[PDB]
Design a protein around this nucleic acid. Structure first.
Length: 30
DNA sequence: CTGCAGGGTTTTTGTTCCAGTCTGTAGCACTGTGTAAGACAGGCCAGATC
């Protein structure tokens, strides 16, 4: 049914790839 | 109910390469601190003996 995931500031900067996609796109379009 | 097997899942974590851009290091030929006396030999003039 998915997966529990701990908070972001403990993950590597890389770990991120998944989270900002939509914001990178929205700022670009903007 | 349990146990673990072995699949589903999302989500780490990293993967290959080509433009570059920054950053730290090795490459450069090359530098600083050792620093003052005496000992031994030979000559020979002085100077005292006598």
């Amino acid at each position: 049914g998915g997966r529990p995931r701990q908070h972001l500031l403990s993950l590597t900067r890389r770990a991120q790839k998944h989270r900002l996609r939509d914001l990178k796109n929205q700022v670009k379009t903007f």
